[PDB]
Design a protein around this nucleic acid. Sequence first.
RNA 1: AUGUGGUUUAAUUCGAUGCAACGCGCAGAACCUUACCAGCCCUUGACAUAUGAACGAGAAACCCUAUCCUUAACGGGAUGGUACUGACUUUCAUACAGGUGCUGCAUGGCUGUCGUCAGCUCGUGUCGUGAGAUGUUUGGUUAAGUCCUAUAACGAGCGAAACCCUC
Lengths: 113, 467, 204, 51, 244, 101
Amino acid sequence: STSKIKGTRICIAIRSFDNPEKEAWCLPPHSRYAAMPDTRTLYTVLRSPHVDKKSREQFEMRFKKRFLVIKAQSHELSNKLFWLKRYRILGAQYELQFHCKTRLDMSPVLGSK
Amino acid sequence: ARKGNPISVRLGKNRSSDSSWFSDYYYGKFVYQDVNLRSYFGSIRPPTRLTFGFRLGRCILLHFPKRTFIHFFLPRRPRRLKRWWTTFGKAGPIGCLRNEIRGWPKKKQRYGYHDRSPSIKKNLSKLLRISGAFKHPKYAGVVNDIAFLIENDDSFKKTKLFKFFFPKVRPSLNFLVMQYFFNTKNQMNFDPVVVLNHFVAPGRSLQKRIRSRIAFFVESLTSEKKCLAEAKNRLTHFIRLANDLRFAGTTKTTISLFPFFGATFFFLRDGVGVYNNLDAREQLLNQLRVKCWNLLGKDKVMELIEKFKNLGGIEELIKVIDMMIEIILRKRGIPYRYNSYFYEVKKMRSFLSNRTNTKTLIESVKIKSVYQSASLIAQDISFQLKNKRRSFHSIFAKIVKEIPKRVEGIRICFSGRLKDAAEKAQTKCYKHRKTSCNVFNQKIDYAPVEVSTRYGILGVKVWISYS
Amino acid sequence: DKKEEEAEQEALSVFVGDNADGEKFAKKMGDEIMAKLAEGYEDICERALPSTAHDALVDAYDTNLMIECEPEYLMPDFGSNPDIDEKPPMPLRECLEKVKPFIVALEGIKDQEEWEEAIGEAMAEAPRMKEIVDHYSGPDRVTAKKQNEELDRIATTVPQSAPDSVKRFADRVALSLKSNPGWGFDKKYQFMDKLVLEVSQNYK
Amino acid sequence: AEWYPYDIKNEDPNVLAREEKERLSKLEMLKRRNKGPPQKGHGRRAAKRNK
Amino acid sequence: IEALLQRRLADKHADTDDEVMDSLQNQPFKDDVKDEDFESDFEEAHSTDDELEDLYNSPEYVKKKMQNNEFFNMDEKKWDVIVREGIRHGILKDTKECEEILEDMLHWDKLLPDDLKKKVEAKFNELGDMCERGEIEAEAAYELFKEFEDEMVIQYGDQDDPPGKGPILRWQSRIVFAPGGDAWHPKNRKVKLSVTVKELGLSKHQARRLRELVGKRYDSGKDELTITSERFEHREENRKDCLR
Amino acid sequence: EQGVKRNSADHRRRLLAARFELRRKLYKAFCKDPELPSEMREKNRYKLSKLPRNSAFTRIRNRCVFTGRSRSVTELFRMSRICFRGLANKGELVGIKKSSW
RNA sequence: AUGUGGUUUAAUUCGAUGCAACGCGCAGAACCUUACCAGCCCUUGACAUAUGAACGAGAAACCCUAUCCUUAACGGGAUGGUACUGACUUUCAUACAGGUGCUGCAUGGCUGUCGUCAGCUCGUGUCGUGAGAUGUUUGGUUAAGUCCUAUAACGAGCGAAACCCUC
Ligand SMILES: [K+]
Ligand SMILES: [K+]
Ligand SMILES: [Mg+2]
Ligand SMILES: [Mg+2]
Ligand SMILES: [Mg+2]
Ligand SMILES: [Mg+2]
Ligand SMILES: [Mg+2]
Ligand SMILES: [Mg+2]
Ligand SMILES: [Mg+2]
Ligand SMILES: [Mg+2]
Ligand SMILES: [Mg+2]
Ligand SMILES: [Mg+2]
Ligand SMILES: [Mg+2]
Ligand SMILES: [Mg+2]
């Protein structure tokens, strides 16, 4: 199926200046792949160290983001976290999102029902 | 609206930057660190008259979480070709001598370099030499059969284990104590049973199974203390010990399981370098022994035989020879055949790692000629003009004559007071073959440099095209 | 090639001195305390003489400890709930005993003597690992329950002779400092201490 | 307080030695032609006022 | 060595020799390297490259050198393969008995039948009764009787959501892996927990009072009560705050 | 301490303000509750006014770290426009490339 | 509203001056910035390196969750407490440190303009005593020495176009 993975899982958010698809080998294995919009920031500077007001040069800074989905059951999350702590992705910073489920203890509040 | 830098137009495509990282909260630290490190590295070991010097062409910096990698590129020395045992002055002029709840947190920094910090490598070395020394006979058997396997079996070579382990205190309680201290210092509840999944690889004895279940039940339901009549029962309650020693056997194999030292060997793989001095180590191993064996005993055997006749405490002579071996290594100064280049590189990595709190690495590459980057060519021209020997036409002619092939054109501009008699500064430009900067799929490199002179500042610009 | 070999020989002989004393020692006492002294020399040689492989394995160990022992990467068991009541931690000697049969079945340990020797080497190696984790992890954490208890206590350390408005002001300042993650705890209790000191300067 | 960072050239003692050698060399090339700084408290206006 | 041997014998200046060791091990020396010695070892330490032809594509060269490293990035599947092959070649030990004993340590109250639990409990009660008197040689004979009746009991014996039961929580937590050796990031300390209101089984008036007490942390289309904590400096502290 | 002569006074001001940050917030906290006694408000206003004026955060000016220019300083890069353009043309500052559209 | 000249003032900081200066340097002047003026201060100095003396085997400077008094304010005088110092701290002396002082008509680097106008040259060959010329002198087309044809010239290089980004 192509429906959304909802449950126990890992989500990796990778932010970079370059495209991560240029070096695809350093990415972790994953179930799903998607991309976010690029974000640009504009700078306009004077060219001269003195009065040349109408001459400008325009630079930009561009941010790129990618989203990875990993399906994982409850027993192997602590196994995968050890390796996920030690990765080396080229020119990137990654974000580890953890989705897990526990249960509620009702004993100290069941008196109030 | 004037002529601009060639690199800025083709920075994205057809070229790549010298650094690779990303941050948003820590951008201002890295954008300063790049500029500061590249400004520092270019002023190290300048060429004298009798030295070729350190000529850095491109410095490549890669940033990873807590690990930073630096790659240097240097040209080979152009030259036409054809002791340690006694040294002095390389040593010491003096042997020295004549809030319980109200604690403080970890201090942070965001924008610059950390403060100067004492190191921990002495304690790490002390832990590693007297812990896990792998001289145990329980570890002696496994290296024997791995030596049998490597020299005779090709299926061991064609196997991923060889390709990782050899790219051409027992450890379990150590990790348990590590995990206990790391959990109790940050005040998270430490259950040691769930730690045991680290010592687990998921990829007949049912009587023992039920006996273990009931032997865990008998230790769960008990321990209601303050009773001596049942403390006698606790004394005869050593069926927990039966459950302990039920699973025992003779083991022939060591452990390469539990991925915590697998990661240590994984880090050892990628940071070995290219240099080792085991030959110079083993040359001194058997010679310092015969030096220290014949040094003592020079009509001064009376103190040694007094030490022998005192008691069986001879092992303080081991501390005596510790002091003497420290004295003899300190007097000469610097290791025996350790390369000075790797000495300076290691000394460089040490202060970089301490100031930034990472584990930085330095990898060097030697290339064939100085004509492989505009920065190298401009540095060469500036060093040639620093002592006046040649004219500008002669320098350009020599560069054109000994330029290597695969360079599709060159151009050099000199500006300043070129002629000594005249005061009005002019510009001289020399060109050769194709230097069309307006084609964006060409490979054009550019570099400036400034020369101090008697009459001010001279300037040199270099454009070079590649095929 | 005569010059370098003659130079190393003249340096080596003047390093080694005169070879009477080593043979005199070989004759004097015997070979067994020489074997003991040779093992002592062997354990020196892994400290005194530098080894590139030793320093590289120390660096790889340093990298592994730097990644592993970081307080910002901690994630506990994924099938558990928090310990709200904050039970005190069981001691290390008792923690090593309820783990016994797994590591006995795993690591080796042929009998109780081998077990106790392993426990001895672990317990004697333990105190310097506290210094290791002191260098890596940091000082401590101090839980927010105790932080709020201390902040409430210094709010109750006001003098009695002050008006009730000052006491309400102190309790409200402690309440608004209670939920501030952008302040250091040292700065928080410094702020409360200085407020109490300034009021006590005029309400003796 | 962290706005002005630390310069990593300050830890290597070779480069500061070469910089101080260049400062001294410039000072000596000024001193060899009697264009160096005067004595403190003995400036030109002080000597003219004493004259 | 004569002088320090004599002072080892005297044992009066024993406070000095340890500081001799500290000074000789710690205090720096004149570690200068002349530039000819700096350059002469470099070319015998490194060999000339043969494939560059220019330094224009230096980053791509370094990145390809790192791409060729097969063990650049490593994961648990790779460790599982290299732990299967070492078991196959006989250098490594199978861990089947270790997971068998770990399952016993984790879950013994679920697999042990209660009809056996009550009879072994009665056996412990009678043996603790007979141990207090001490007339049965309870140090060893009681343990022997325990082993005999335990063998008798073993002869009688030998013939997706989370575990357990209750309302189910859902957690969310973030770790930022920043480069450069400075680890603290502001996104570290935020924890969210989600719960379904109807699983608590509250009455209608109790649910209305909950909704009034909550406000907009309740989402009606999903019956989702979500509590987020950022007010504490550490991730576990925010988790505990969410549960409280 | 940092090397650039023209940034020395502003660096001194930054250190002096980071020293006195705690007392300034404390007296500003006392002066903002009107239910508090008038004499205590007056005393805290006096002690806040007696603080060193160079320790005030409004005297701190952003200057360029490589040069010391007092105008047109981008806070993200901490460099002035001239240093920023010179380093961006070469290809040094990461991320920033030319821009067209 | 804002900039400039002029005028006045203790000071009204300086630069930019036809096109190509004048909402320009200034993408932020209440104090700071600030370069200008008036008072109150300091002199190896707010900061660096070296040498030579003096003090100190733990004192002094230094610092603080500091306190009080006095100054328009910087500062100055007391009172507390912690911690450190021997290839190391401080104090004094002299080499000096320092300068938004002048010269853009001594310079590097950076920029405006002629000008996105289509131009500016070189190597061999030929003509001319020579400076020089031809190539780049025909007939057309093009935004364009862009392309064809013709031509004692044959070929190159920097420019044009395309390669680049975006819709
Ligand atoms: K010609
Ligand atoms: K055109
Ligand atoms: Mg200046
Ligand atoms: Mg401001
Ligand atoms: Mg003017
Ligand atoms: Mg102009
Ligand atoms: Mg002023
Ligand atoms: Mg003003
Ligand atoms: Mg001035
Ligand atoms: Mg000019
Ligand atoms: Mg002018
Ligand atoms: Mg023309
Ligand atoms: Mg012509
Ligand atoms: Mg053309």
